[PDB]
């Protein structure tokens, strides 16, 4: 589908509220495999299971390994912009 821009708001005491799978070393994008109920990704309304995360806060994720993506994603704080696409 279309590439979309999505805003997520979170406080410092929370995680993002997602599970991810995939990564470059597996030949798979960074994919959302879970949205956890009531946590910031669920509350922002625009992120869904099956979405590929293309970038976060302008940091490209298309060619990142799994653990690289985890470090990058877990470093972001507050008002966070995602670039995602559902295939």
């Amino acid at each position: 589908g279309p590439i979309r821009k999505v805003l997520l708001l979170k406080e410092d005491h929370e995680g993002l509220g997602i599970s991810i799978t995939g990564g470059k070393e597996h030949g798979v994008p960074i994919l959302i495999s879970e949205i956890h109920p009531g946590q910031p990704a669920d509350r922002c309304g625009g992120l869904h299971v099956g979405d590929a995360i293309l970038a976060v806060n302008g940091v490209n994720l298309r060619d990142t390994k799994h653990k690289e993506a985890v470090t990058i994603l877990s470093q972001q704080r507050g008002e966070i912009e995602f670039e995602v696409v559902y295939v």
Partner: peptide, 7 residues
């Protein structure tokens, strides 16, 4: 087979 991480 693919890893999953909660974040």
């Amino acid at each position: 087979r693919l890893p999953t991480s909660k974040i």
